[PDB]
Structure 1
Amino acid sequence: TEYKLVVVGADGVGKSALTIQLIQNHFVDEYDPTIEDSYRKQVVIDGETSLLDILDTAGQEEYSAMRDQYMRTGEGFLLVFAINNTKSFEDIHHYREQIKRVKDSEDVPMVLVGNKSDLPSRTVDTKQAQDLARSYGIPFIETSAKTRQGVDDAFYTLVREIRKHKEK
């Protein structure tokens, strides 16, 4: 089994740091903000061996046809914001609508991720994030790429959401 996972969200929220924790087991400071890359990892989740193919998105805000078709191959999406950046939380709606648009579907596996939970300078309350996730009908996972809090949980929860979708 293989799952195509895509990590989206505003610049600086920790998409690259979360991905590199999952894949390479270390915390990277100031990874080049412009680099989009992909990684594969073999995991066991609830007894099922699978390959996670993870796209760590980056780059300019552009909407080419090639970009839509490429994003459309994603089976599940992490919607990442940082808990110290209210604008990144406000931007979650945008990324969700673009995912719906390219997938031509109201039911796309997604997980809301509030990253940088190790920082004291919080501006987005856990209750606001839980309420947003409830409104979308998706899970909310608190993470820190720095301490590895919630990292496996975020990705594995997204796989569980894909499996639920495939059962419908």
Structure 2
Amino acid sequence: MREYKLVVLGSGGVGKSALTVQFVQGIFVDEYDPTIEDSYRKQVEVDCQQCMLEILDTAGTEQFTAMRDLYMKNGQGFALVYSITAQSTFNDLQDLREQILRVKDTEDVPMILVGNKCDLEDERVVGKEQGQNLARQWCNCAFLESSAKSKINVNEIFYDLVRQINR
């Protein structure tokens, strides 16, 4: 069956691990344990079809920065995650988009922009339309707001990357 190498990218504390663990294991990770390296695998039914997903959950460190193009070169699909409760993590993503297109020698790279923590509406400091604007700017990039805690749009992140890959 087809394997899908996915890569989860974004600043510290935005929910990259919580999203990935919710997806693969169906549990919510409550406490913040900064990631050094972690990979996960999951076989999934996409549309109606067998897909092996390997998900690389990345650190926000100098070491990841020094390896990043390697993760990009090898990855087939990218979730770029920020938190709606933390402005700097949204401003940090632009760089990541342009680099992926640089490394892949194309603008048609499977990608999704993910505003996570949508259950924390009272703490929101980045607008929904504000994320939709950034995605639009990125050549009509896929966009979701998600919650690893409420399980809103979690599977959809990975299924949309697999559907993107398939096209």
| Superposition TM-score, scaled by structure 1 size | 0.91
Question: Cα deviation per residue 1:49-71 (whole Å; 9 max; x = unaligned)?
Answer: 1111100001412443x542333
Q: Which amino acid aligns with 1:142?
A: E
Distance 1:17 1:45, change over 3 A: same
> Which runs of 5 or more residues in structure 1 are unaligned?
none
Percent of matched pairs sharing the same residue: 58
Say if 1:9 and 1:79, in contact at 8 Å, map to a contact too. Answer: yes
Say if 1:17 and 1:31, in contact at 8 Å, map to a contact too. Answer: no
- For 1:67 and 1:123, the matched residues in 2 are separated by 28
Question: Cα deviation per residue 1:99-118 (whole Å; 9 max; x = unaligned)?
Answer: 12222322211000010000
- Equivalent residue number for residue 137 of structure 2: 135
Q: Which amino acid aligns with 1:130?
A: Q
- For 2:47 and 2:15, the matched residues in 1 are separated by 26
- For 1:72 and 1:154, the matched residues in 2 are separated by 20
- For 2:57 and 2:90, the matched residues in 1 are separated by 18
- For 2:134 and 2:92, the matched residues in 1 are separated by 12
The answer as to 2:164 corresponding to 1:161 is: yes
Say if 2:13 and 2:32, in contact at 8 Å, map to a contact too. Answer: no
Query: Shift of residue 160 of structure 1?
Result: 1.3
Following superposition, which runs of at least 4 residues in structure 1 exceed 6 angstroms of deviation? none
* SS of match in other structure, 1:42: strand
The answer as to 2:46 corresponding to 1:45 is: yes
* SS of match in other structure, 2:33: coil
**Aligned CA-pair RMSD:** 1.4
- For 1:28 and 1:163, the matched residues in 2 are separated by 30
> Which runs of 5 or more residues in structure 2 are unaligned?
none
- For 2:150 and 2:91, the matched residues in 1 are separated by 25
* Greater Cα shift, 3-12 or 90-99: 90-99
The answer as to 2:86 corresponding to 1:85 is: yes
**Residues 93-108 of structure 1: pairs in structure 2 closer than 5 A:** 93-108=94-109
Say if 1:111 and 1:138, in contact at 8 Å, map to a contact too. Answer: yes
Query: Shift of residue 27 of structure 1?
Result: 0.4
Q: How many residues align?
A: 163
Query: Shift of residue 156 of structure 1?
Result: 0.6
- Equivalent residue number for residue 151 of structure 1: 154
Q: Which amino acid aligns with 1:146?
A: K
Say if 1:36 and 1:59, in contact at 8 Å, map to a contact too. Answer: no
